[PDB]
Structure formats: structure tokens, C-alpha cells
Scaffold this active site. Sequence first.
Site, short mmCIF file in Angstrom:
data_model
loop_
_atom_site.label_atom_id
_atom_site.label_comp_id
_atom_site.label_asym_id
_atom_site.label_seq_id
_atom_site.Cartn_x
_atom_site.Cartn_y
_atom_site.Cartn_z
N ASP A 1 -8.44 -0.68 -8.09
CA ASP A 1 -7.74 -1.09 -6.84
C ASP A 1 -7.25 -2.53 -6.92
O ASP A 1 -6.24 -2.86 -6.25
CB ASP A 1 -8.67 -0.95 -5.65
CG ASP A 1 -7.93 -0.68 -4.36
OD1 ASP A 1 -6.66 -0.45 -4.37
OD2 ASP A 1 -8.64 -0.68 -3.36
N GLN B 1 -6.20 -17.70 -3.23
CA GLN B 1 -6.21 -16.87 -4.48
C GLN B 1 -7.41 -17.30 -5.34
O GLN B 1 -8.17 -16.40 -5.77
CB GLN B 1 -4.84 -16.93 -5.18
CG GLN B 1 -3.77 -16.08 -4.46
CD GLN B 1 -4.07 -14.61 -4.58
OE1 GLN B 1 -4.37 -14.09 -5.67
NE2 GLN B 1 -4.07 -13.93 -3.44
N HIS C 1 1.65 1.52 -5.77
CA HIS C 1 0.23 1.08 -5.85
C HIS C 1 -0.66 2.25 -6.28
O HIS C 1 -1.51 2.08 -7.17
CB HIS C 1 -0.18 0.51 -4.51
CG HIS C 1 -1.64 0.25 -4.41
ND1 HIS C 1 -2.25 -0.73 -5.13
CD2 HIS C 1 -2.59 0.82 -3.64
CE1 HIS C 1 -3.53 -0.79 -4.80
NE2 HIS C 1 -3.77 0.17 -3.89
N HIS D 1 0.84 -1.23 0.00
CA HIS D 1 0.00 0.00 0.00
C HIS D 1 0.86 1.27 0.00
O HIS D 1 0.77 2.09 0.89
CB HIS D 1 -0.99 -0.04 1.16
CG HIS D 1 -2.10 -1.00 0.94
ND1 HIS D 1 -2.17 -2.20 1.63
CD2 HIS D 1 -3.19 -0.94 0.14
CE1 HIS D 1 -3.26 -2.83 1.27
NE2 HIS D 1 -3.89 -2.09 0.32
N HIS E 1 -5.96 7.44 -3.05
CA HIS E 1 -6.99 6.58 -2.40
C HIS E 1 -6.42 5.81 -1.21
O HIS E 1 -7.23 5.23 -0.44
CB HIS E 1 -7.66 5.64 -3.40
CG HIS E 1 -6.85 4.44 -3.66
ND1 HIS E 1 -5.72 4.47 -4.44
CD2 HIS E 1 -7.00 3.18 -3.25
CE1 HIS E 1 -5.20 3.24 -4.49
NE2 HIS E 1 -5.96 2.43 -3.76
N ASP E 2 -5.11 5.70 -1.07
CA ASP E 2 -4.50 4.95 0.07
C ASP E 2 -3.49 5.84 0.83
O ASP E 2 -2.66 5.30 1.56
CB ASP E 2 -3.81 3.67 -0.40
CG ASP E 2 -4.71 2.44 -0.50
OD1 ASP E 2 -5.68 2.32 0.32
OD2 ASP E 2 -4.48 1.63 -1.40
C1 LIG Z 1 -4.62 -10.40 -5.24
C2 LIG Z 1 -5.36 -9.53 -4.28
C3 LIG Z 1 -5.71 -8.23 -4.44
CL1 LIG Z 1 -5.44 -7.38 -5.90
C4 LIG Z 1 -6.33 -7.48 -3.43
C5 LIG Z 1 -6.63 -8.04 -2.28
CL2 LIG Z 1 -7.47 -7.17 -1.04
C6 LIG Z 1 -6.30 -9.41 -2.05
N1 LIG Z 1 -6.48 -10.21 -1.04
C7 LIG Z 1 -5.89 -11.37 -1.43
C8 LIG Z 1 -5.87 -12.52 -0.48
C9 LIG Z 1 -6.88 -13.57 -0.87
C10 LIG Z 1 -6.78 -14.75 0.05
N2 LIG Z 1 -5.65 -15.31 0.34
C11 LIG Z 1 -5.84 -16.32 1.25
C12 LIG Z 1 -4.84 -17.11 1.77
C13 LIG Z 1 -5.17 -18.11 2.65
CL3 LIG Z 1 -3.89 -19.04 3.33
C14 LIG Z 1 -6.49 -18.35 3.03
C15 LIG Z 1 -7.51 -17.55 2.53
C16 LIG Z 1 -7.17 -16.53 1.66
S1 LIG Z 1 -8.19 -15.38 0.87
N3 LIG Z 1 -5.37 -11.39 -2.64
N4 LIG Z 1 -5.62 -10.10 -3.03
MG LIG Z 2 -7.30 1.09 0.54
ZN LIG Z 3 -5.61 0.57 -2.80
#
Ligand SMILES: Cc1c(Cl)cc(Cl)c2nc(CCc3nc4cc(Cl)ccc4s3)nn12
Ligand SMILES: [Mg+2]
Ligand SMILES: [Zn+2]
Length: 312
Positions: free
Chosen positions: A216, A268, A71, A67, A105-106
Amino acid sequence: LMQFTLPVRLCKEIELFHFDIGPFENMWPGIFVYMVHRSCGTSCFELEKLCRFIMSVKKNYRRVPYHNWKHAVTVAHCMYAILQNNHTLFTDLERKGLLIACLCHDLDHRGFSNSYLQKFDHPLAALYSTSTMEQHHFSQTVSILQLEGHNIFSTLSSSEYEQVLEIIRKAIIATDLALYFGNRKQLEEMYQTGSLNLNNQSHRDRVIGLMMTACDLCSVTKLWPVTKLTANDIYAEFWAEGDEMKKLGIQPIPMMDRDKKDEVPQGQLGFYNAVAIPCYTTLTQILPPTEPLLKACRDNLSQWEKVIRGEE
Ligand SMILES: Cc1c(Cl)cc(Cl)c2nc(CCc3nc4cc(Cl)ccc4s3)nn12
Ligand SMILES: [Mg+2]
Ligand SMILES: [Zn+2]
């Protein structure tokens, strides 16, 4: 008559949704001005004020893994690509407001979630009970707009100025992913029952909110090596937050627990299926020229499917 120009490769690829702004920090201000000049006009901002604003915005991003200033510029470039691919759909104030909102935005993010600020009992959580970090980001944006020589909107009327700051406030608040789910559901219903009306301001607001989520999340719409290496920065933050949760005596969710790295590939997959793909699908239904974002997102989902199948 002082145009910004880019080397040839950047001049051609900055127009594409999947452009990566590169590792040269010092070129990012110029990349942003280039984008303002083509999406808005050479007339939108006084160059000296705009540069001064950009450099104070940069100084108010922190040295955190994800962040950060890179970004900010990355999210502004995705908004640039949407705006350039949907020329005639947006008002003059929207073109002005939305690149600034994406750059801001951040602002002053610390690398911690709204949830962590509530459990830590951070002062910001008592000032802003929901969308805590997003209300802060908008508050930092108004601070910077009010510094001597930093009012990039100084040629707007009272009422135009109020309208642009209201576009920016709503756009920044919409980057709270907690608000995305309900916004996308309402947009889906409105599109499918044919009630979606871009002359209705509260409908425009929803579409801009969805654009802000799309910009975002735009790491999932890049070339796979960019997507995969960005994921490393995203987890470096989440795992630091997980450590801070363990210090408050709280088991973090697996997303934030560095002991559960093995679960990332499946995590993911859930994220692409629950958040990203639904985001770019509804965006593509409303704004057909944004389809390359949906295509790139689905291509990255297949890459994560290969990681699970042990083929990567
Ligand atoms: C690529 C991306 C963007 Cl662009 C923005 C945000 Cl907010 C974001 N959050 C994640 C995390 C998603 C997740 N990872 C995990 C890992 C485990 Cl061990 C268990 C459940 C989950 S749920 N990837 N991501
Ligand atoms: Mg934000
Ligand atoms: Zn952001």
C-alpha cells in the site's frame, strides 16, 4: 495455451520492486493477468471470468487523484514482486488471494479518510465503527465476486473458498494504517524474541498484514520522480479533505491544510521515519529478499532531506 506477454522492457522491469506500470490505462488489465499467470499459474483462474472480474473491479474505482484504479494495480504489482522473491513461503490459496486482495483493497474509495467519514456522519461510519473504508472495500469485493460470471474462485471447495475470502478480508482490513503500528510492534517483538513461527496461522496473518502495508505504501519505494509526482496526487486528496473539514467548521491537521504546503518536506520526513522505514525494516527482517524496498525507501528519504536543504 494463451500466454500473456509484455514488450521486452516491461517483461524485464515488471520483475523489479520499483517498476512503474506507466500511463497507458488500457495495458493495466493485461499487466495484472500477466502477474496472476506467473505468480499463481495459467490454471489458477478461468481467463474469461478473471477478465470479467478485473473490468468490474476497475468500474468500481472512482476518478479520484490517488485512491484510483492505477493505485490498485500498483499495490498488486508490489505484492507480485514480494511473492516472486519468496516463491516457496506462500500457500496456493495465499498466492490466489493476495493479488485479488491488492486489486480490491480500495474499491469505491471516495478520497476521504475514516476520520472525515466519522466527522461528516456518513452512513458507512454507522455501519462500520472502525476500519470504516476497509470494511466497505471488502463488502464491494464480495458484491463483485457474487455477480453472474464473476466467481473466479468457483473451482475451490466450500472450505477453501471460505479460507481464501478470509485471507482477502484480513489483508484488506490490514490496509487500515491505524492497525499497522500495533501489528508492526508485535512482529518486531516476535522476531527479536525468536517466537515468530510461520506455521502459526495468527503469525502468518500478521506477516500478510505487514506485506499489505508495504504494498500500500510502495510509492515511497519508486524512482524519485515517481515518488515525488505521486506525492502530488496524495496531497491533492488530503487538501480536498482539509477543505471539506473547513466546511464542517473544523481546522484540519496541517497534512490536510493546503495553506501549509511549506510543511510538506518535514511531514514526509516524519512519515518515512515513523511509518515507511519501520515497515520495510521489519519486512526485510522477516523476508530478506524484500530488502530492495527498504533500500529504495531510504534513497527517497535522502531526496526529501535534499528538498529541505534547498538542494531540490
Ligand atoms: C507518501 C505517503 C504514502 Cl505512500 C501514504 C500515505 Cl498514507 C502518506 N501520507 C503522507 C503524508 C505524510 C505527512 N505529510 C504532512 C504534511 C504536513 Cl504539512 C504536516 C504533517 C504531515 S505528515 N505521505 N504518504
Ligand atoms: Mg485504503
Ligand atoms: Zn491503498
